[PDB]
């Protein structure tokens, strides 16, 4: 019933970037399309759950995920990085303004790398600007 969306162009012929998200009780379904295209899907889920307070800081900020490739390349080093960052954005920021996230996206958005941190930050900003 509730759709979230955001349409822009990748920085700075500018390709259209389209983000959309539907939120459910078990999961969020996120689309990230490049010129309308979308060719991969990943499931991102959280891995379970004198002296010092740093060891609880560590455990309270250890945030590991399982990234499962449902469609597309299952051995892209840049994917689990993007997926976890998107997942963490949802957990720490977007909700609010349990964890499962299904991400369908264009692999064409992403020493093989191109401009990867800037492009990662921009996509994260787009998702946040959606109110994901």
């Amino acid at each position: 019933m509730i759709s979230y969306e955001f349409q822009t162009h990748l920085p700075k012929e500018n390709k259209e970037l389209y983000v959309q998200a539907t939120h459910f009780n078990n999961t969020i379904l996120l689309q990230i399309r490049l010129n309308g295209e979308m060719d991969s899907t990943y499931e991102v889920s959280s891995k379970g759950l004198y002296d010092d307070e740093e060891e609880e800081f560590v455990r309270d900020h250890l945030s590991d995920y399982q990234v499962v490739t449902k469609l597309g390349d299952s051995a892209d080093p840049k994917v689990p990085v993007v997926c976890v960052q998107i997942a963490e954005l949802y957990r720490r920021v977007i909700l609010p303004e349990q964890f499962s996230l299904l991400i369908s996206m264009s692999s064409k958005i992403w020493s093989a790398d191109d401009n990867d941190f800037g492009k990662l930050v921009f996509v994260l900003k787009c998702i946040k600007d959606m109110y994901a």
Binding site: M1, S3, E5, Y18, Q20, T22, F24, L29, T41
Partner: protein
Amino acid sequence: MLVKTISRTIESQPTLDVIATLPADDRSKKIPISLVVGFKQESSSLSCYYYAIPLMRSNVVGIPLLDTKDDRIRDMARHMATIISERFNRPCYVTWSSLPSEDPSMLVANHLYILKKCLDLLKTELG
């Protein structure tokens, strides 16, 4: 803009709630259809996420991306994605959204109705 999403209720048998992401400009090609479909009340679960695409260029190949153990839900999502992909000759992602209150026997009883109404909507919305 090359894609757009629309929110639709289909009325006048259960009322259906739809979010569809669609090519803004359409013949039969590269931009996938995504459909979220469920019953409407008046929170929901993503019960199944199904993908289909034409194999050649009819053969359409499909697979559950998020599977369900419930055949009644799986059948619907499979048929929806596969028939949409055939109908429009493009890839299709389908989500079946389950109301907290859903009795999936309703999907069985209204199976053909649900498919045709979604095809009808998509025809119009793709022109």
